[PDB]
Amino acid sequence: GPYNEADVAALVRSLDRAEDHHIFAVDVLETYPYLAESYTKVCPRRCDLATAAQKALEGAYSYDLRLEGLKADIALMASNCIAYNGPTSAYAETAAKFERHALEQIDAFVLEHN
Numbered sequence: 001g002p003y004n005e006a007d008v009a010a011l012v013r014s015l016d017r018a019e020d021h022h023i024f025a026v027d028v029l030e031t032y033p034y035l036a037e038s039y040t041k042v043c044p045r046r047c048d049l050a051t052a053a054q055k056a057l058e059g060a061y062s063y064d065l066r067l068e069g070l071k072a073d074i075a076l077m078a079s080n081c082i083a084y085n086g087p088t089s090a091y092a093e094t095a096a097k098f099e100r101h102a103l104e105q106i107d108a109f110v111l112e113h114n
């Protein structure tokens with residue numbers, strides 16, 4: 001049946017790493033509301049790990065056996081960072097490493113529970 005909501009939420013929180021300098025921890029516009037005018041045009045759909053953990057606790061991912069919806073939220077976080085900060089920035093480098101690690105951890109979770 002469905003995944004345990006707390007276990008998925010714990011997976012999400014484990015993706016918030018000091019190795020990524022916590023850049024995906026919370027909504028970009030929660031920490032930097034002054035970016036909103038430019039950010040919402042470049043990135044009209046936002047996500048962050050605190051939001052994703054709450055989605056997990058409410059069952060948003062529970063019936064997605066492959067966790068494809070969570071993978072899509074991770075991909076949105078990374079692609080928004082690359083789009084807004086630009087492809088030559090250090091933020092873009094962190095985004096790519098973050099997404100790769102997140103995919104490895106999500107895949108391991110699916111294999112341990114499928």
Ligand SMILES: CC(=O)N1CC[NH+](CCn2c(CCc3ccc(C)c(C#N)c3)nc3cc(-c4c(C)noc4C)ccc32)CC1
Pocket residue numbers: 020021022023024025026028031032080081084085090091094
């Ligand atoms: C939960 C909480 O209280 N937090 C956790 C989050 N930090 C903010 C972290 N952060 C810092 C500061 C650390 C830093 C500086 C410079 C570089 C090149 C790197 C890298 N790579 C990292 N730049 C940030 C930039 C963004 C960001 C995104 C995503 N897309 O557009 C922007 C702008 C988000 C968080 C950021 C505030 C305190």
